[PDB]
Structures are given as structure tokens and as C-alpha cells.
């Protein structure tokens, strides 16, 4: 009942037979910007299925000494398909997301990943007064890895990361996690190339372990933008 799930958006569909419900961030669902909250007066474009569909990122390998991985939205999707083209041709962007993280292994494997969506994950640098640079933060589709997941790379605690929308992928229990993210910003719309509303972090709290014959155990992220709308049409900049 709560273990199988099908997500269908646009021309894309995902099935999971080992889900554990799914999380709606702060009990909200994505929606278009209403008139009583709108600021930009030009008529927005709403590509619907052309952009509100699952895009699958490159899988990463869960290793024994893995510290964790992170991706920033919309930066990770800013050069992918019609979402990327709309982002590059429009000054203003607005959308939510549907995140589906996949990781399977055998019944002889053990491991626990915290899959947490952090709003406004302003990263800090380690052992220096210099602020993180543009290249340290803006990683695109590839994303990045945690230097110190114990402190979430920001001087806070990983133990308290559960205050944020999150699921767990515990290998004995489930093989996928699903999080629904509404628009999360101080402003109704934002420039998609300079600000990142959400950061998806996958941190192996319990390391991968087994005594069978070792196999590559990848982690795969599929993100579907939702209720995409764009304002301020002009030439592409990327």
C-alpha cells in the first residue's frame, strides 16, 4: 500500500516497489504564482509537460569512505532540456520540485542514507575567513560532495538536519526516497542563475557494508520541476 508508488509527470514515469510513503515539504504542494502574490506584470509562459517532467542526473557510487553528495536547485537543472532552455531565455523563474532518490542492494547489504532537502543551504568554508567562491558553490548537474557532513559544511549539526524535509533510505527497509518541494523563497520569483532555493543532500549516516561479493552500488537522483513558470523573455545568456 505505502510501499509501491508510481510518479507520472509529462512523458516520464517512475515506479518503486520499496518506497516508504513520501514527504511533502512542510505539508505543502507546489502551485503556480497567484495574482494576489504576483509582482512581474508580463504574461508568464507555463511550458507544462515540456519542463514538468523527470530529469535523471548522473549516478554516483556509494563507497565505504563516501562522505555524501549534494546538488543545488535550480542550478543542477539549469542546462538540461526545455527547462534549461527556458531558464536561459528568461530573467525570472519559479517552480517547485519532485525529487526521487534511488538506491538498491541485496538483502545481505546494510546502509543508511539521509536524503534531506535543505532550503537556502548557504555553505561555509573550512579553516579560513575567505568566503566560498563561485566555482565552489555552482557545480551544475554534477553537484558536489560534503567536506564535513558531520557539520553539514556550514558549522551546524548533521544530527539536527531532520528539522528539514527528509527521508531515509535504509537498505534493509527501502530502496527509494521521495520528497515534494514547493516554491521556497523570500520573493515570488527569482533569477535562476544566481540563487539556489533548495539543496538536495544525500549523506551516508551508516556506511555501506556487506560480506557477499562486492558490487557497484550507485545512487541515482531524478528531479522533476513542477508548476514551472518563467518571466522576462529575452535572448539566451547561459
Amino acid at each position: 500500500s505505502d510501499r509501491v508508488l508510481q510518479l507520472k509527470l509529462g512523458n516520464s514515469a517512475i515506479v518503486t516497489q520499496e518506497a516508504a510513503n513520501y514527504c511533502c515539504a512542510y505539508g505543502e504542494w507546489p502551485n503556480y504564482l497567484p495574482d494576489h502574490e504576483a509582482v512581474a506584470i508580463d504574461k508568464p509562459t507555463q511550458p507544462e509537460t515540456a519542463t514538468d517532467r523527470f530529469y535523471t542526473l548522473k549516478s554516483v557510487k556509494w563507497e565505504t569512505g563516501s562522505t555524501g553528495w549534494w546538488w543545488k536547485l535550480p542550478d543542477a537543472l539549469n542546462n538540461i532540456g526545455m527547462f534549461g532552455q527556458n531558464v536561459q531565455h528568461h530573467y525570472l523563474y519559479r517552480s517547485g520540485f519532485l525529487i526521487h532518490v534511488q538506491c538498491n542492494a541485496t538483502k545481505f547489504h546494510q546502509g543508511a542514507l539521509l536524503v534531506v532537502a535543505i532550503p537556502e543551504h548557504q555553505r561555509g568554508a573550512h579553516n579560513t575567513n575567505t568566503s566560498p567562491g563561485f566555482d565552489d558553490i555552482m557545480k551544475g548537474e554534477e553537484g558536489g560532495t560534503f567536506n564535513h557532513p558531520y557539520v553539514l559544511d556550514d558549522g551546524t549539526s548533521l544530527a539536527c538536519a531532520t528539522i528539514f524535509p527528509h527521508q531515509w533510505i535504509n537498505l534493509r527497509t527501502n530502496n527509494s526516497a521521495t520528497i515534494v518541494l514547493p516554491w521556497m523563497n523570500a520573493a515570488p520569483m527569482d533569477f535562476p542563475l544566481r540563487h539556489n532555493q533548495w539543496t538536495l543532500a544525500i549523506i551516508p549516516v551508516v556506511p555501506l557494508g556487506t560480506r557477499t561479493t562486492s558490487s557497484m552500488v550507485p545512487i541515482t537522483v531524478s528531479i522533476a520541476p513542477m508548476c514551472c513558470e518563467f518571466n522576462g523573455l529575452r535572448h539566451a545568456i547561459t
Binding site: 505505502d2 510501499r3 510513503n21 513520501y22 511533502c24 524535509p165
Partner: protein, 39 residues
């Protein structure tokens, strides 16, 4: 006591006793009943 013309000049407002912890404690699409197994 507020004789100023701008409403933001008023003293603090400590009367908002409304709560909704479930937005942080149970942000799941399918609610979980007591006693019944979650999975």
C-alpha cells in the same frame, strides 16, 4: 499605549498561540494512524 500614527511602532504581540507541529513532525502525504504499523 500607542499614540504613534504608524502601526509598526506598537509594542510586541505575544498573543499568537496557534500551532501546527505536523508540518515538521509528520510531513507525509498519507497520515499515520496510532497503533497501526507505519509500513
Amino acid at each position: 499605549i500607542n499614540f504613534y500614527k504608524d502601526s509598526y511602532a506598537a509594542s510586541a504581540s505575544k498573543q499568537d498561540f496557534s500551532q501546527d507541529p505536523s508540518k515538521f513532525t509528520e510531513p507525509v502525504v498519507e497520515g499515520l494512524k496510532a497503533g497501526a504499523p507505519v509500513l
